[PDB]
Design a binder for these strands. Structure first.
Length: 43
DNA sequence: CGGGTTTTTGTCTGGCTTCACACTTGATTTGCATCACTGTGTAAGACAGGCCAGATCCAG
């Protein structure tokens, strides 16, 4: 159901970067980082 | 006016679930306001007025 898109793959691939490089915070900071990274780069 | 005898329950007690709860952003899906119109209103009766007809009256 609900076939994902390029952004969902971006999330599922680049969230573990911040989840393993800085595990001291919850994935709220990881989402915030991934979002400020996507907004600064292209698609 | 209040003594017996079961119901009706929140806990004490601490330790096992299954759901609850921060963030995105780009869609995707619902929810709701807006606009020019609609149908149901739906057959007879009362009254004045012109018109001849025939009754009402006049005079040789």
């Amino acid at each position: 159901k609900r076939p994902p898109s390029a952004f969902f793959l971006f999330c599922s691939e680049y969230r573990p970067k911040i989840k393993g490089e800085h595990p001291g915070l919850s994935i709220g900071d990881v989402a915030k980082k991934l979002g400020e990274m996507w907004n600064n780069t292209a698609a």
